[PDB]
Design a protein around this ligand. Structure first.
Ligand SMILES: *CCC(=O)Nc1cccc(C)c1Nc1ncc(OCc2c(Cl)c(OC)cc(OC)c2Cl)cn1
Length: 271
């Protein structure tokens, strides 16, 4: 069926499938020789594959995600393609495996009891936001609109590096969506900037649920009449200011990812 790409093909005999991560399905694996320098050395990776019940369209979608990830290329702050198995057996798409799970769960697990101080300092929270902005800036430079940026879709490595997940998926989390996406089904880089603002609020609530209480029904009317989430407790005004800029009704009045990187850089340099 599928052509052999010599830049990406990985020997499936050097890939040891382990415990499922989610169910098409994603399984944890040991890969031998992901570093050509030390070809004996093992590394933990994630493998995406189809289930037997999968249609021709399911396969086309996984081929599309593989091909878009090859073209976008690699960055520190995205979940990178590592290799593929396309020959004499099922399609495997091999990617980086982030040890510490998604950013939502990482933050929620590090909530202190009541009003005590948590292990997560202001500079570490701002660093999380900065790394996600750097990842989105890169994806934007590779003509990639995410469409579903949220803390659940950012993963965390052993060394607390943020990696944007699921940026290559083939075409409802309404609480993350820009009004033009809600009402007009239009997704742009500036729609992603709105979602980044919601993610910033998730970071400074240590994984809070957005618009808490307000049912999806009343959200659309709230946004139309100029209302937005309130400054979360202990969130400095500079960072609430950035959230509110991301939530301007006019896409052109929202900051660019370049301006978000620069703004978050300025906060980190000031500490
Ligand atoms: C790595 C060790 C481990 O088990 N990590 C773990 C444990 C619980 C939850 C999570 C989210 C993780 N990390 C983790 N899970 C999945 C993952 O890759 C998924 C994936 C796939 Cl398979 C993909 O295929 C094309 C594309 C992706 O985004 C570009 C992603 Cl995120 C990575 N890390």
């Amino acid at each position: 069926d599928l052509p052999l790409d010599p830049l990406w093909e990985f020997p499936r005999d050097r890939l040891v499938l382990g415990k499922p991560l989610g169910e098409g399905q994603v399984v944890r694996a040991e890969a031998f020789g992901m570093d050509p320098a030390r070809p004996d050395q093992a590394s933990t990776v994630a493998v995406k594959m189809l289930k037997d019940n999968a249609s021709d369209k399911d396969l086309a979608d996984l081929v599309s995600e593989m091909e878009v990830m090859k073209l976008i290329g690699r960055h520190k702050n995205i979940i990178n393609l590592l290799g593929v198995c396309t020959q004499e057996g099922p399609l495997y798409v091999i990617v980086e495996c982030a040890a510490k799970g998604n950013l939502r769960e990482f933050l929620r697990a590090r909530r202190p009891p009541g009003s005590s101080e948590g292990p997560l300092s202001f500079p570490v929270l701002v660093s999380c936001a900065y790394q996600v902005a750097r990842g989105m800036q890169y994806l934007e430079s590779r003509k990639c609109i995410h469409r579903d940026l949220a803390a659940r879709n950012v993963l965390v490595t052993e060394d607390n590096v943020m990696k944007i997940a699921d940026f290559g998926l083939a075409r409802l989390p309404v609480k993350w969506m820009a009004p033009e996406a809600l009402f007009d089904r239009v997704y742009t880089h500036q729609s992603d900037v709105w979602s980044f603002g919601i993610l910033l609020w998730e970071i400074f609530t240590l994984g809070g649920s957005p618009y808490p209480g307000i049912p999806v029904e009343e959200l659309f009317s709230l946004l139309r009449e100029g209302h937005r989430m309130d400054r979360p407790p202990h969130c400095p005004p500079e960072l609430y200011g950035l959230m509110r800029e991301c939530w301007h009704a006019a896409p052109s009045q929202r900051p660019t990812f370049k301006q978000l990187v620069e703004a978050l850089d300025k906060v980190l340099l000031a500490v």
